[PDB]
Amino acid sequence: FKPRNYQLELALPAMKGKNTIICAPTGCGKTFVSLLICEHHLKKFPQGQKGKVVFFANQIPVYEQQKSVFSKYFERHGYRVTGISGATAENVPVEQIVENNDIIILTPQILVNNLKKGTIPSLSIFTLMIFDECHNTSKQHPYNMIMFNYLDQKLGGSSGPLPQVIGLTASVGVGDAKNTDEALDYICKLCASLDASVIATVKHNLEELEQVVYKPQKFFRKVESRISDKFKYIIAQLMRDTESLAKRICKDLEFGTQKYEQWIVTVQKACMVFDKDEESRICKALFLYTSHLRKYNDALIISEHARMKDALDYLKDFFSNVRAEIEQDLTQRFEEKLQELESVSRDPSNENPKLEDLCFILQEEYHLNPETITILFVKTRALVDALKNWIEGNPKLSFLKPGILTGRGTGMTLPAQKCILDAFKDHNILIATSVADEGIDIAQCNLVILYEYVGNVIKMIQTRGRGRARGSKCFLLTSNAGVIEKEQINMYKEKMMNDSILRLQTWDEAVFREKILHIQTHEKFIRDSQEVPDKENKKLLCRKCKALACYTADVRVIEECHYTVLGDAFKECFVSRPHPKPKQFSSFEKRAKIFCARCSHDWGIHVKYKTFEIPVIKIESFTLYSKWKDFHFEKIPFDPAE
RNA sequence: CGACGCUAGCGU
RNA sequence: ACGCUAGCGUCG
Ligand SMILES: Nc1ncnc2c1ncn2[C@@H]1O[C@H](COP(=O)(O)OP(=O)(O)O)[C@@H](O)[C@H]1O
Ligand code: BEF
Ligand SMILES: [Mg+2]
Ligand SMILES: [Mg+2]
Ligand SMILES: [Mg+2]
Ligand SMILES: [Zn+2]
């Protein structure tokens, strides 16, 4: 690769030693920029001094790719390149691995753990730190944690040769800024977080850049929601019935929208605090009652954004997971109206006008350009399958050869994700979710459809990375009309972003270097200023059947994070099944998923820790607590001796 | 099992 | 400003 002139331009500040945030559009080759930087940095040292670079990537695919490029590139120059990720994290001398390698590709969460564990004494070991997607440096994110460590050693009395810090991104973001001054403040905060005295962008070479990356034309499609109440009418009855069945027990109480969802979750929270014998029958009934009631609320939301068939099949798939006592009654109410709902799904006149417009868009582009590659973004993983079936089930769309991309959680694994991206060069169109955010550098697309897709200014600028080619088009399809305005804001926010950067770049240096020091200092003492056990024995009950699980005295903590149970008393209370994720995370190894032996509620997982094979539980499956952090009791460290 | 980010809704 | 709920994604 012959370096483009603007790649040198973006590299210039970093090569002169300044801490720099490099802001350039996706696909412009920011990767090769960090190579030029990194190469220049190592060759600046005299014999008897060696530089040590750490490249950060917060996604495994990006991690593996960088380690590949860097290794192939820098092997010739006599620099040893290595990497450490979650799989290679455990049972290795991290300190010596860092010591014996000149360039090190890393996940940030690993450097955080090694700093906290003390295995890595200080960042002074590194002469250079490169943050990829540096806009993630903020809040509690791992990137920011690494910099908190960096900032304390700076502002503290502790003296060390702190590393040069570089960062990379297509956008810094304006945050919540309503204007230039607020936007300029947010960017200044980020610069301080990364200790950057310079924001680098293409200026002199702009004409070259725009012949590489092109800004795809954006279109706003405002449609209308279906007026037909036929489908939601019957289900509104079913939900109205389940409301009575629940009200037929507790007798006390305090819509297919999001507001209604938070209620049913609150109802369940209210039913779990409710003789102890009939109590289990009551709680289990309410749990099963609200569960179906909550999944009926889902079938509504789906019917709005997709076919009625997709919602009916979502229930048809649900009730299949129900079977294999009070469930037989509720499925009876469904089976009763099912015959009627089967016909409503078959009626073409009731078709979603939001889909018809999406169909129309797809017909035009492929009629114009049959070689079109498309990415269709959606919100929920459920809606991913709903549209998959819709395309293959549409005679008009027959030219489409759809494929799916999702995250891990129904979950799609990494090799499953990669398997789709390779066929996307067989696959005509890719239905997906936010996984595409920050980019995997997948196949180029001349068409990008945003289906009820809300996001920030950063994701917006990133998603263009699919449309680098001239003539690429992007559509936004929503019936809400609030989604339109939300995107409009982001467009204005990008303007504020680029205006503020130009305005910041005019400032004399050493004045700005002074301001970031003033931003760092204020942020430090507030960060240091933000910082009672209960020895009583409490009983942990299963949130579903309220059966006895174990006592707080039994529970031990593993490495300050994970909670387990001691004794064979617990072993009679649960069952287990192998879950198809035999991957080792951290010190553990995932083997099977735990279930209630009474019920079948998910308690936690059964793993392998060192020599011992021991279960691990989550409190949110057992007053109620969402996490163990919120649960205050005497924490007994797990002792190998017992 | 845990941590973290984004979006929407809600509350001091 | 934080907190809570859900969706979505990522990492250990
Ligand atoms: N000077 C260059 N000449 C030709 N291709 C380049 C050059 N620099 C980068 N690329 C190509 O850009 C592609 C992706 O760019 P990338 O490094 O991911 O930039 P960004 O991080 O901004 O998205 C790479 O596959 C690479 O082949
Ligand atoms: F590197 Be790109 F901006 F995702
Ligand atoms: Mg990149
Ligand atoms: Mg090694
Ligand atoms: Mg992230
Ligand atoms: Zn149970």
XYZ file of C-alpha atoms (C1' of nucleotides) and ligand atoms in Angstrom:
701
model
C 0.000 0.000 0.000
C 1.346 3.372 -1.097
C 0.303 5.718 1.731
C -2.257 8.329 0.708
C -1.215 11.924 1.361
C -4.000 12.435 3.904
C -2.838 9.366 5.845
C 0.495 11.108 6.351
C -1.353 14.293 7.311
C -3.344 12.501 10.018
C -0.117 10.825 11.144
C 1.986 14.002 11.358
C 0.958 15.159 14.859
C 1.466 11.700 16.372
C 4.839 11.302 14.668
C 5.990 14.561 16.274
C 5.185 13.173 19.722
C 1.882 14.911 20.410
C -0.999 13.004 21.987
C -3.530 12.937 19.172
C -7.122 12.003 18.471
C -7.281 11.136 14.775
C -10.767 11.790 13.413
C -11.387 10.524 9.873
C -14.302 8.850 8.050
C -14.782 5.069 8.121
C -12.950 3.213 5.358
C -10.334 5.921 4.806
C -7.727 3.466 6.111
C -7.130 4.676 9.665
C -5.559 1.257 10.281
C -2.572 1.973 8.041
C -2.208 5.358 9.741
C -1.569 3.665 13.087
C 1.036 1.487 11.355
C 2.931 4.499 10.004
C 2.741 6.043 13.470
C 3.745 2.826 15.251
C 6.607 2.201 12.806
C 7.972 5.732 13.165
C 7.691 5.528 16.951
C 9.854 2.424 17.355
C 12.607 3.671 15.040
C 12.981 6.944 16.969
C 14.779 5.222 19.859
C 18.578 4.954 20.166
C 20.288 1.572 20.644
C 19.950 0.761 24.348
C 16.415 2.109 24.482
C 13.401 0.243 23.092
C 9.825 1.384 22.576
C 6.792 -0.662 23.580
C 3.446 -0.165 21.838
C 0.045 -1.367 23.028
C -2.791 -1.433 20.486
C -6.305 -1.648 21.943
C -9.286 -3.253 20.211
C -12.560 -3.808 22.072
C -13.928 -6.421 19.644
C -12.358 -9.857 19.062
C -12.618 -9.837 15.249
C -10.885 -6.450 15.137
C -8.363 -7.785 17.665
C -7.449 -10.787 15.510
C -7.173 -8.707 12.342
C -4.884 -6.059 13.838
C -2.608 -8.697 15.371
C -2.377 -10.252 11.900
C -1.506 -7.064 10.001
C 0.909 -5.813 12.659
C 2.673 -9.182 12.885
C 3.137 -9.520 9.122
C 4.264 -5.899 8.826
C 6.640 -5.514 11.776
C 8.279 -8.962 11.773
C 10.655 -7.740 9.068
C 11.814 -4.755 11.114
C 12.830 -6.967 14.035
C 9.876 -6.107 16.261
C 8.140 -8.962 18.064
C 4.360 -8.718 17.787
C 2.011 -10.567 20.134
C -1.528 -10.419 21.465
C -3.637 -11.309 24.487
C -7.394 -11.926 24.477
C -9.868 -13.648 26.793
C -8.999 -17.146 25.585
C -5.249 -16.611 26.024
C -5.754 -14.467 29.141
C -5.554 -17.061 31.914
C -2.593 -19.048 33.255
C 0.136 -17.084 31.476
C 2.814 -14.643 32.714
C 1.159 -11.510 31.303
C 3.952 -9.314 32.672
C 6.697 -11.222 30.852
C 4.649 -11.527 27.664
C 4.464 -7.726 27.647
C 8.163 -7.483 28.521
C 9.369 -9.738 25.699
C 7.285 -8.174 22.915
C 7.711 -4.806 21.211
C 4.136 -4.503 19.902
C 1.160 -5.852 21.834
C -2.455 -6.047 20.662
C -4.868 -6.136 23.577
C -8.469 -6.085 24.705
C -8.841 -3.227 27.192
C -10.650 -5.352 29.798
C -7.469 -7.433 30.077
C -5.217 -4.465 30.851
C -7.759 -3.299 33.432
C -7.666 -6.676 35.181
C -3.867 -6.830 35.089
C -3.580 -3.327 36.559
C -6.076 -4.095 39.323
C -4.397 -7.436 40.051
C -1.063 -5.613 40.175
C 0.629 -7.918 37.664
C 1.298 -4.827 35.545
C 2.800 -2.205 37.879
C 2.277 0.856 35.666
C 1.540 2.146 32.165
C 5.082 3.553 32.218
C 6.139 0.253 30.643
C 4.534 1.451 27.402
C 6.037 4.233 25.297
C 2.872 4.350 23.167
C -0.839 3.559 23.559
C -3.189 3.390 20.566
C -6.936 3.349 21.256
C -9.030 2.117 18.328
C -12.549 3.570 18.392
C -11.280 5.949 21.079
C -14.718 7.575 21.345
C -15.522 4.748 23.761
C -13.360 6.427 26.378
C -15.904 7.694 28.860
C -18.042 6.560 31.793
C -17.206 3.084 33.154
C -16.005 1.694 29.797
C -12.713 -0.300 29.943
C -10.923 2.348 27.831
C -11.706 5.024 30.402
C -10.544 2.781 33.250
C -7.129 2.456 31.607
C -6.946 6.244 31.347
C -8.052 6.797 34.945
C -4.910 4.823 35.740
C -2.975 7.030 33.312
C -4.389 10.287 34.677
C -3.658 9.445 38.316
C 0.011 8.803 37.526
C 0.073 12.123 35.676
C -1.618 14.408 38.198
C -0.208 12.419 41.112
C 3.215 12.985 42.638
C 4.235 9.658 41.114
C 6.865 10.134 38.409
C 7.070 7.860 35.386
C 7.669 8.135 31.639
C 3.968 8.196 30.756
C 3.140 6.850 27.274
C 2.199 8.894 24.241
C -1.524 8.354 23.660
C -3.173 8.079 20.260
C -6.817 7.504 19.411
C -8.863 6.638 16.348
C -12.511 7.155 15.407
C -14.878 8.486 12.758
C -16.509 10.707 15.374
C -15.808 12.071 18.850
C -19.500 12.849 19.330
C -21.055 15.988 20.812
C -22.883 14.092 23.555
C -26.042 15.882 24.694
C -24.851 19.242 23.327
C -27.633 21.588 22.200
C -25.154 24.067 20.705
C -21.552 24.795 19.692
C -20.385 25.716 23.198
C -21.843 22.552 24.718
C -20.526 20.498 21.805
C -17.094 22.079 22.172
C -17.150 21.218 25.880
C -18.024 17.562 25.301
C -15.183 17.177 22.803
C -12.804 18.882 25.239
C -13.855 16.377 27.906
C -13.001 13.471 25.599
C -9.629 15.011 24.734
C -8.889 15.279 28.447
C -9.997 11.691 29.036
C -7.470 10.596 26.406
C -4.980 13.336 27.356
C -4.958 14.593 23.755
C -3.524 18.023 22.945
C -4.377 17.641 19.246
C -7.367 16.634 17.137
C -6.188 15.529 13.690
C -8.416 15.702 10.613
C -7.993 15.906 6.842
C -7.659 19.530 5.729
C -5.110 20.092 2.959
C -5.702 16.713 1.294
C -9.532 16.754 1.491
C -9.915 16.328 -2.283
C -8.018 13.027 -2.143
C -10.101 11.638 0.722
C -13.426 12.283 -1.007
C -12.355 10.191 -4.002
C -11.871 7.264 -1.607
C -14.767 7.631 0.823
C -18.083 8.950 -0.506
C -20.978 10.190 1.621
C -24.033 8.088 0.735
C -27.262 9.964 0.008
C -29.789 9.649 2.833
C -33.564 9.381 2.418
C -36.381 9.707 4.959
C -39.440 7.493 4.522
C -42.362 8.426 6.772
C -45.123 5.819 6.562
C -48.373 5.210 8.450
C -49.307 2.447 10.895
C -51.970 -0.139 10.051
C -55.439 1.049 11.066
C -56.767 -2.514 11.203
C -57.583 -3.512 14.783
C -58.600 -7.038 13.747
C -55.493 -8.835 15.021
C -54.850 -6.777 18.157
C -58.562 -6.997 19.009
C -58.604 -10.718 19.800
C -55.326 -10.564 21.725
C -56.529 -7.498 23.633
C -59.254 -9.852 24.833
C -56.782 -12.598 25.760
C -54.687 -10.100 27.709
C -57.886 -8.761 29.269
C -58.666 -12.317 30.372
C -55.211 -12.955 31.825
C -55.648 -9.684 33.719
C -58.706 -11.230 35.373
C -57.079 -14.608 36.066
C -54.307 -12.707 37.843
C -56.856 -10.422 39.493
C -58.729 -13.589 40.479
C -55.978 -14.317 43.018
C -54.329 -11.175 44.407
C -57.447 -9.080 43.724
C -55.334 -5.895 43.787
C -53.776 -3.832 40.994
C -52.413 -0.306 40.522
C -51.751 -1.259 25.809
C -49.199 -2.906 23.518
C -46.511 -0.278 24.099
C -43.231 -0.067 26.020
C -45.014 1.553 28.966
C -47.149 -1.566 29.379
C -44.063 -3.785 29.341
C -42.428 -2.078 32.325
C -45.678 -2.707 34.209
C -45.768 -6.488 33.718
C -42.144 -6.627 34.854
C -43.167 -4.606 37.915
C -46.157 -6.893 38.493
C -43.833 -9.905 38.556
C -41.613 -8.064 41.032
C -44.738 -7.451 43.118
C -45.879 -11.082 42.901
C -42.526 -12.460 44.070
C -42.748 -10.756 47.478
C -46.145 -12.386 48.070
C -48.915 -21.015 54.725
C -46.081 -21.284 52.172
C -47.910 -24.224 50.541
C -50.620 -22.622 48.405
C -48.138 -19.748 48.119
C -46.075 -21.673 45.559
C -49.208 -22.429 43.539
C -50.099 -18.733 43.680
C -46.656 -17.421 42.718
C -46.207 -20.016 39.970
C -49.653 -19.170 38.602
C -48.964 -15.431 38.618
C -45.498 -15.962 37.146
C -46.955 -18.079 34.344
C -49.873 -15.655 34.043
C -47.709 -12.546 33.709
C -45.193 -14.437 31.566
C -47.806 -15.189 28.910
C -49.210 -11.693 29.418
C -45.741 -10.253 28.814
C -45.192 -12.367 25.697
C -48.610 -11.322 24.399
C -47.402 -7.731 24.665
C -44.477 -8.782 22.476
C -46.769 -10.239 19.810
C -48.383 -6.801 19.588
C -45.163 -4.825 19.075
C -44.204 -7.325 16.361
C -47.520 -6.999 14.507
C -46.840 -3.266 14.197
C -43.375 -3.608 12.662
C -44.097 -6.779 10.673
C -46.709 -9.262 9.440
C -49.472 -10.562 11.685
C -48.161 -14.004 10.731
C -44.818 -13.193 12.348
C -46.544 -12.387 15.636
C -48.794 -15.439 15.450
C -45.777 -17.634 14.711
C -43.983 -15.923 17.595
C -46.796 -17.254 19.778
C -46.898 -20.547 17.871
C -43.205 -20.883 18.702
C -43.790 -19.756 22.289
C -46.529 -22.252 23.185
C -44.310 -24.950 21.676
C -41.773 -24.065 24.375
C -44.500 -24.138 27.028
C -45.460 -27.782 26.534
C -42.419 -30.071 26.765
C -50.910 -27.371 34.997
C -52.281 -23.828 34.779
C -50.508 -23.607 31.418
C -53.042 -26.031 29.934
C -55.802 -23.540 30.728
C -54.092 -20.523 29.169
C -53.117 -22.453 26.034
C -56.790 -23.413 25.813
C -57.773 -19.746 25.578
C -55.214 -19.308 22.797
C -56.164 -22.479 20.913
C -59.779 -21.298 21.001
C -59.159 -18.052 19.112
C -56.282 -19.540 17.095
C -58.590 -20.819 14.350
C -59.878 -17.270 13.901
C -56.414 -15.698 14.091
C -55.249 -18.161 11.435
C -57.597 -16.495 8.944
C -56.768 -12.897 9.891
C -53.133 -13.680 9.111
C -54.155 -14.950 5.668
C -56.074 -11.789 4.727
C -53.957 -9.755 2.268
C -56.019 -6.584 2.780
C -54.581 -6.259 6.296
C -50.933 -6.192 5.173
C -48.584 -3.784 6.945
C -48.178 -0.612 4.852
C -44.747 -0.237 6.463
C -43.677 -3.496 4.811
C -45.319 -2.600 1.500
C -43.212 0.553 1.304
C -40.132 -1.476 2.233
C -41.093 -3.915 -0.516
C -41.460 -1.032 -2.965
C -38.018 0.388 -2.139
C -36.388 -3.011 -2.645
C -38.167 -3.569 -5.962
C -36.916 -0.276 -7.401
C -33.217 -0.601 -6.577
C -32.840 -4.215 -7.706
C -34.844 -3.468 -10.854
C -32.338 -0.676 -11.462
C -29.306 -2.572 -10.154
C -29.748 -6.371 -9.801
C -26.197 -6.620 -8.409
C -27.297 -4.527 -5.413
C -26.035 -5.585 -1.990
C -28.278 -4.542 0.908
C -28.103 -4.323 4.698
C -31.426 -4.124 6.532
C -31.146 -2.900 10.127
C -33.760 -3.706 12.771
C -34.165 -3.320 16.528
C -35.151 -6.671 18.068
C -33.675 -10.073 17.202
C -37.267 -11.300 16.944
C -37.918 -8.811 14.146
C -34.816 -10.123 12.357
C -36.429 -13.524 11.818
C -39.842 -11.975 11.164
C -38.487 -10.114 8.128
C -36.355 -13.074 7.044
C -39.510 -15.156 6.662
C -41.267 -12.208 5.033
C -38.705 -11.840 2.237
C -38.544 -15.549 1.401
C -42.339 -15.597 1.688
C -42.864 -12.704 -0.734
C -43.262 -13.477 -4.465
C -42.291 -9.890 -5.301
C -39.008 -10.191 -3.384
C -37.965 -13.533 -4.927
C -34.787 -11.939 -6.313
C -33.596 -11.547 -2.704
C -31.334 -14.171 -1.118
C -31.467 -13.123 2.563
C -29.073 -13.919 5.396
C -28.988 -13.143 9.117
C -26.516 -11.437 11.455
C -27.077 -11.128 15.214
C -25.229 -10.951 18.528
C -24.481 -13.637 21.114
C -27.282 -14.396 23.564
C -31.357 -17.942 19.944
C -27.813 -16.575 20.037
C -25.473 -16.541 17.041
C -21.843 -17.439 17.772
C -18.690 -15.848 16.335
C -17.957 -18.552 13.744
C -21.641 -18.326 12.809
C -21.347 -14.567 12.335
C -18.165 -14.926 10.277
C -19.806 -17.649 8.179
C -22.505 -15.200 7.076
C -20.115 -12.340 6.322
C -18.151 -14.568 3.933
C -21.272 -15.538 1.973
C -22.274 -11.866 1.792
C -19.793 -11.158 -1.026
C -24.558 -16.267 -2.142
C -26.424 -13.809 0.084
C -28.003 -10.890 -1.774
C -29.100 -9.004 1.354
C -28.114 -9.080 5.040
C -30.752 -8.657 7.742
C -29.040 -7.546 10.937
C -28.943 -5.731 14.265
C -26.517 -3.271 15.871
C -23.648 -5.804 15.533
C -22.553 -3.821 12.470
C -21.802 -0.877 14.781
C -18.139 0.245 14.826
C -17.715 -2.040 11.806
C -16.300 -5.482 11.081
C -15.185 -4.143 7.677
C -17.686 -6.415 5.907
C -18.777 -6.448 2.254
C -19.547 -3.137 0.553
C -23.196 -2.225 0.013
C -24.823 0.259 -2.347
C -28.060 0.095 -0.342
C -28.606 0.498 3.411
C -32.090 0.356 4.939
C -32.728 1.569 8.477
C -35.988 0.013 9.663
C -37.348 1.796 12.743
C -33.678 2.313 13.636
C -32.752 4.891 16.283
C -29.131 5.673 17.139
C -26.584 8.339 18.051
C -24.419 10.569 15.858
C -21.471 8.170 16.157
C -23.290 5.099 14.831
C -24.715 7.261 12.041
C -21.265 8.315 10.832
C -19.996 4.744 11.163
C -22.801 3.099 9.174
C -21.684 5.144 6.155
C -18.654 2.853 6.113
C -20.811 0.398 4.180
C -21.548 3.033 1.534
C -17.998 4.183 0.725
C -18.623 3.695 -3.000
C -20.115 6.452 -5.147
C -23.877 6.146 -5.551
C -24.556 4.301 -2.297
C -27.997 5.073 -0.866
C -29.475 4.960 2.637
C -33.130 4.897 3.713
C -34.807 5.540 7.065
C -38.222 3.889 7.397
C -40.471 4.729 10.357
C -44.165 5.236 11.147
C -43.405 6.975 14.447
C -42.369 10.383 13.043
C -40.325 10.828 16.226
C -37.608 8.611 14.776
C -37.318 11.015 11.843
C -36.722 14.014 14.106
C -34.308 12.005 16.263
C -32.140 11.370 13.201
C -32.485 15.018 12.141
C -30.933 15.977 15.482
C -27.968 13.658 14.881
C -27.386 15.321 11.512
C -27.239 18.701 13.239
C -25.044 17.190 15.952
C -22.486 16.099 13.356
C -22.392 19.685 12.105
C -21.714 20.957 15.617
C -19.033 18.285 15.927
C -17.094 19.297 12.813
C -17.527 23.013 13.504
C -16.239 22.633 17.059
C -13.203 20.639 15.917
C -12.306 23.336 13.386
C -12.801 25.912 16.132
C -10.650 23.904 18.563
C -7.927 23.373 15.961
C -7.542 27.156 15.609
C -6.591 27.466 19.282
C -2.867 27.845 19.891
C -1.293 24.733 21.379
C 0.005 24.852 24.979
C -3.155 26.896 25.651
C -5.239 23.834 24.858
C -2.714 21.573 26.579
C -3.361 23.808 29.585
C -7.150 23.505 29.359
C -7.121 19.699 29.235
C -4.937 19.720 32.352
C -7.659 21.831 33.957
C -10.285 19.342 32.754
C -8.264 16.347 33.954
C -7.677 17.846 37.397
C -11.338 18.672 38.044
C -12.438 15.234 36.851
C -9.936 13.482 39.124
C -11.007 14.710 42.566
C -14.666 14.133 41.695
C -13.704 10.615 40.606
C -11.870 10.039 43.894
C -14.706 11.579 45.923
C -17.506 9.303 44.679
C -16.380 6.404 46.872
C -21.892 -2.101 56.309
C -22.273 -5.894 55.990
C -25.275 -7.854 57.289
C -24.330 -11.012 59.200
C -27.961 -12.143 59.496
C -28.917 -15.409 57.790
C -31.399 -15.029 54.920
C -33.193 -17.723 52.906
C -32.877 -17.792 49.106
C -36.049 -18.932 47.336
C -36.672 -19.695 43.663
C -38.374 -16.669 42.087
C -40.743 -18.991 40.213
C -41.970 -21.684 42.616
C -40.563 -20.131 45.813
C -38.844 -23.436 46.639
C -35.927 -23.548 49.084
C -32.593 -23.189 47.285
C -29.968 -22.403 49.929
C -28.943 -20.070 52.765
C -26.683 -17.005 52.623
C -24.328 -18.776 55.034
C -23.807 -21.488 52.416
C -22.900 -19.071 49.622
C -19.228 -18.309 48.944
C -17.698 -15.716 46.602
C -15.169 -16.588 43.897
C -12.705 -13.835 42.998
C -14.972 -11.079 44.354
C -17.433 -11.594 41.473
C -19.105 -14.995 41.177
C -21.251 -16.689 43.829
C -21.488 -20.449 44.437
C -23.019 -22.964 46.866
C -21.492 -25.564 49.201
C -22.944 -28.897 50.312
C -24.833 -31.806 48.770
C -28.086 -30.364 50.115
C -28.191 -27.973 47.163
C -27.488 -30.732 44.639
C -30.900 -32.336 45.199
C -32.652 -29.021 44.501
C -31.521 -28.481 40.887
C -31.019 -30.208 37.544
C -28.736 -29.333 34.633
C -28.500 -29.615 30.854
C -25.546 -28.986 28.578
C -26.081 -25.601 26.905
C -24.459 -25.306 23.458
C -21.784 -22.840 24.612
C -18.797 -24.942 25.765
C -16.520 -21.881 25.852
C -14.220 -20.875 28.705
C -14.763 -17.327 29.967
C -12.265 -15.930 32.471
C -11.057 -18.596 34.922
C -14.203 -20.704 34.458
C -15.416 -23.125 31.803
C -19.058 -23.139 30.702
C -20.452 -26.685 30.698
C -24.145 -26.872 31.598
C -27.000 -24.547 32.556
C -28.715 -25.046 35.919
C -32.486 -25.454 36.299
C -34.915 -25.921 39.198
C -35.622 -29.539 40.175
C -39.043 -28.861 41.721
C -40.683 -25.388 37.691
C -37.487 -25.406 35.614
C -36.538 -21.805 36.431
C -32.984 -20.856 35.464
C -30.833 -20.565 38.594
C -27.440 -20.154 36.952
C -24.670 -22.181 35.312
C -22.573 -25.216 36.238
C -18.900 -24.630 35.435
C -15.350 -25.857 36.024
C -13.163 -23.765 38.339
C -9.610 -25.059 38.744
C -9.798 -28.582 40.216
C -13.402 -28.155 41.354
C -16.646 -28.488 39.402
C -19.111 -26.211 41.169
C -22.388 -24.427 40.336
C -22.619 -20.638 39.999
C -25.800 -18.653 40.645
C -27.269 -15.240 39.829
C -29.269 -13.434 42.511
C -31.747 -12.076 39.956
C -33.015 -15.665 39.725
C -33.708 -15.694 43.483
C -36.838 -8.556 48.725
C -35.453 -8.935 45.194
C -32.025 -7.989 43.835
C -31.006 -7.354 40.222
C -27.294 -7.875 40.926
C -25.072 -9.199 43.724
C -23.587 -5.729 44.192
C -26.932 -4.470 45.491
C -27.097 -7.418 47.894
C -25.385 -6.533 51.171
C -24.388 -9.424 53.425
C -21.249 -11.043 54.823
C -19.103 -12.107 51.875
C -17.214 -15.331 52.573
C -14.324 -15.831 50.123
C -14.221 -19.252 48.466
C -11.525 -21.292 50.200
C -9.975 -24.308 48.422
C -9.703 -25.754 51.932
C -13.148 -26.793 53.176
C -21.583 -16.316 35.734
C -19.940 -11.201 35.745
C -18.672 -6.481 33.782
C -19.332 -2.598 30.211
C -21.522 0.510 26.069
C -25.825 2.248 23.074
C -31.146 3.377 22.552
C -36.117 4.090 24.436
C -39.344 4.704 28.749
C -39.805 5.967 33.863
C -38.305 8.296 38.904
C -35.138 11.835 43.227
C -26.146 14.605 36.892
C -27.182 9.589 38.682
C -30.691 5.497 39.523
C -34.443 1.839 37.627
C -36.935 -1.294 33.540
C -36.715 -3.301 28.623
C -34.368 -3.858 23.949
C -29.538 -4.279 21.523
C -24.447 -5.088 21.274
C -19.631 -6.017 23.173
C -15.873 -7.849 26.419
C -13.656 -10.938 30.810
N -3.193 3.404 1.192
C -4.198 2.412 1.090
N -4.306 2.008 -0.195
C -5.212 1.056 -0.534
N -6.022 0.500 0.431
C -5.916 0.906 1.732
C -5.029 1.841 2.078
N -5.133 2.051 3.419
C -6.101 1.231 3.895
N -6.585 0.519 2.863
C -7.604 -0.454 2.855
O -8.850 0.086 3.752
C -9.482 -0.980 4.128
C -10.232 -0.709 5.486
O -9.825 0.558 5.973
P -9.641 0.759 7.460
O -8.246 0.503 7.815
O -10.566 -0.220 8.236
O -10.023 2.260 7.833
P -11.056 2.666 9.006
O -10.554 2.186 10.291
O -11.197 4.167 9.041
O -12.380 2.060 8.737
C -8.376 -2.035 4.306
O -8.824 -3.257 3.913
C -7.214 -1.564 3.394
O -6.977 -2.593 2.329
F -12.773 2.068 11.829
Be -14.199 2.464 11.427
F -14.524 3.959 11.753
F -15.230 1.580 12.170
Mg -10.547 1.065 12.454
Mg 4.966 -14.330 24.574
Mg -18.105 -1.457 23.419
Zn -38.074 -23.378 41.312
